[PDB]
Amino acid sequence: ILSTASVLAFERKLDPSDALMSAGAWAQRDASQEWPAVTVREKSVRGTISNRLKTKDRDPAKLDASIQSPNLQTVDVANLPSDADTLKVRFTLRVLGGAGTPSACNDAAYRDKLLQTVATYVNDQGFAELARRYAHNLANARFLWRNRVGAEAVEVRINHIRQGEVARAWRFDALAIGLRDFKADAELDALAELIASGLSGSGHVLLEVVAFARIGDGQEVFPSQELILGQKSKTLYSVRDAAAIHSQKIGNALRTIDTWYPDEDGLGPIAVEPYGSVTSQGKAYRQPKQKLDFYTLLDNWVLRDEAPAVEQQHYVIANLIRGGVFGEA
Amino acid sequence: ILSTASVLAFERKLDPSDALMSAGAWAQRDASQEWPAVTVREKSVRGTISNRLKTKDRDPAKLDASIQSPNLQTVDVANLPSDADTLKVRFTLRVLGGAGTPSACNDAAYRDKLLQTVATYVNDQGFAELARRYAHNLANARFLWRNRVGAEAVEVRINHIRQGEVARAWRFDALAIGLRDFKADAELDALAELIASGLSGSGHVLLEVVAFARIGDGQEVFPSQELILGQKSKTLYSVRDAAAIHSQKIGNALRTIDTWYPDEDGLGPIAVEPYGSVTSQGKAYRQPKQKLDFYTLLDNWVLRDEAPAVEQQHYVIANLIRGGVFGE
Amino acid sequence: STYIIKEVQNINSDREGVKVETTSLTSAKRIASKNQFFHGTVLRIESESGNWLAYKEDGKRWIE
Amino acid sequence: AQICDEALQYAARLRELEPGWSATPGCQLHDAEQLWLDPLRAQTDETFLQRRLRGDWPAEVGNRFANWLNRAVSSDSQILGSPEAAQWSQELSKELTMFKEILEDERD
């Protein structure tokens, strides 16, 4: 029967580090060192009643009463230095490898079957497709959620550090590269090959990504808001008195490769997550009712050895690469 | 039938940045750069009790007691340098675009219907009306709340930054431009066209607004007070040892265009806000009992496809541009 | 009795919950167990306010 | 009444247990509280400590207590125009009057 092990875990791969931020002049972009970080600050904000009230209270007096006593609230905002028109973001990326290698498995038969299926898939076709998809996300600024929107010029520089020095540099353009379309390029192919090798375990791979986006003088950046609990209801993530973006928040966008979602109605690339859940869209594609579900596909391809379509196999390999907890009680 | 989404949010558009302030002489207006900044300072202010007495008038003996115990208080004030008669305010403005594009929606049908209605409205008539209204606010000094009152000469300069270089400059006069009346001008039309294009997504748009108001030597500016949260009852907002104005406080004045409120327009422009609330007036125009409410108008124009008057449609588009949280 | 039923991975979390409006706690507990939407989640029952009424781990019995 | 009673007992036990309190941080809103428990003038101190406290009556303690209770106990905005709000304000005023009167004789 080879029942799935009640306890299954897969260590995540492609785990990047924190992303520091700084400001500077687009001209000095060639020389970007010693730039002061953006420090978070607090500013008083006088709110109002913008919430949608129910139909129970329609008396106009109640509304005027609320305006008498305003709602005082404190928030945190981060703005570029007095004289700075370009924002800089620096984050590293590592490739561990052994995606299919399970971290912990209760039954040996299941682990052996999984390793066999993974080796078979790799032999039939390599991870070059996933590596190429990840290369586009790393090249473009898709990792940014709101900083990219409304940008004049975005320039990404992906370096390669092997022994601690700059081995091979790469420079791309996020704006020129299509957001919803993937195009082939010599540099993209080289990067995809390097990522595939690292994942296969041919050697250590470290890539330092640095992006420069033109926003404007004195503009306000949108860092990752922290969790709270005039009481401050908005806390911006800051490390070493410097603004930054969460590691998981970056790794989530970076893995927005999956584009075979059943909806196929203009949504475009969707982050690889079980059940195709989307917070912004509020809809979870690839529901369990359909055979395209990740759990159903893996269970079938393991117990019945039913190899699904190349698209489903790619999605399943992406999920295994991302890692997680599977099985049941 | 079609129901609304319990979670609806629209990212704000036309989001400006902080406004730095400096002091200089009208003669040196050309040398705008290198003007020193205004540093906030603290001063002891002693005052008596001027609060209105309670309903029960007390004996006069207690009143004299208060005088023997004055209330010591410390506040913060900002004054121009020893020799400076002109104040300068510099702030940038960006146009993101995609106002109608919803940031997040639970139901796809609702999002598609909203995008369809927005495209239909744009095809029928463009945002040129909203862009023209915003152009007047940017041209005039409406952004200043108290600094403008009692000014000799106010000169606004709205530049256009393209790929880092100044593309097109503009120079207007807030005093010459009517505060309660909107008049047409070639420059205003050009600015409105540029704003409409930016909002439509024809390209990046950055406008640096710099105002110079003649107040007087050693005058006292009125920056935005911060929350008290050193026995300081009044704290002035200051960044990098320089006074400034809140982003929202600037965007509210820059967005004080809506004038079709149900009232007879006895007052000046009112910023687009839900329930037409007004802090200074203490009242809320466009009460929910009427049908002109933003929520009611959008619900009708979405579920029943009832297109309201051009004025209501303009107000609804302005609200969507401003952005916010709707639904539940 | 309004009871808020919430689900979270670890007992320490802040996730919204459904209002059962049941007569007694035992009813809310039986309803949460019968309608449990996940295997490894930790059921957390709380009153209308922020006070935690009780919690139950995936592999453990109800606790208060 | 029980709230004012339990409150006065805390100040009484504090003054009856602590020999005194010197300068402390956060004196912006805590200045009125320090005047509730008044230690004796030190032998090595000056004569300007009691002189300034003698001509000053503790009147901010009542406001700080009223605001503290208002923030501690929750109320409804729509109920401000109801009959319950009137009795609540009347009770709070009656309690604040006796509370301020109790401290008025303390300095005097």
Curated annotation (Swiss-Prot), chain D:
Protein origin, superkingdom: Bacteria
Disrupted gene: phenotype observed: Mutants lose phage DMS3 infection-dependent inhibition of biofilm formation while there is normal biofilm formation in the absence of phage infection. Decreased production of crRNA in the presence or absence of phage. Disruption of the entire Y.pestis-subtype CRISPR region disrupts crRNA production but does not alter phage resistance (possibly OLNs PA14_33350 to PA14_33310, and the flanking CRISPR loci), indicating this CRISPR is not involved in phage resistance.
Family as reported in the entry's similarity comment: Belongs to the CRISPR-associated Csy1 family.
Free-text function comment from the UniProt entry: CRISPR (clustered regularly interspaced short palindromic repeat) is an adaptive immune system that provides protection against mobile genetic elements (viruses, transposable elements and conjugative plasmids). CRISPR clusters contain sequences complementary to antecedent mobile elements and target invading nucleic acids. CRISPR clusters are transcribed and processed into CRISPR RNA (crRNA). Cas3 and Cascade participate in CRISPR interference, the third stage of CRISPR immunity (Potential). Involved in crRNA production or stability.
Subunit structure: Interacts directly with Csy2; part of the Csy ribonucleoprotein complex with a probable stoichiometry of Csy1(1),Csy2(1),Csy3(6),Cas6/Csy4(1)-crRNA(1). A Csy3(6),Cas6/Csy4(1)-crRNA(1) subcomplex is also formed.
Miscellaneous note of the record: In this bacteria, Y.pestis-subtype CRISPRs do not confer resistance to phage DMS3 or MP22, but instead are required for DMS3 infection-dependent inhibition of biofilm formation and possibly motility.
Entry protein name: CRISPR-associated protein Csy1
Organism of derivation: Pseudomonas aeruginosa (strain UCBPP-PA14)
Name of the coding gene: csy1
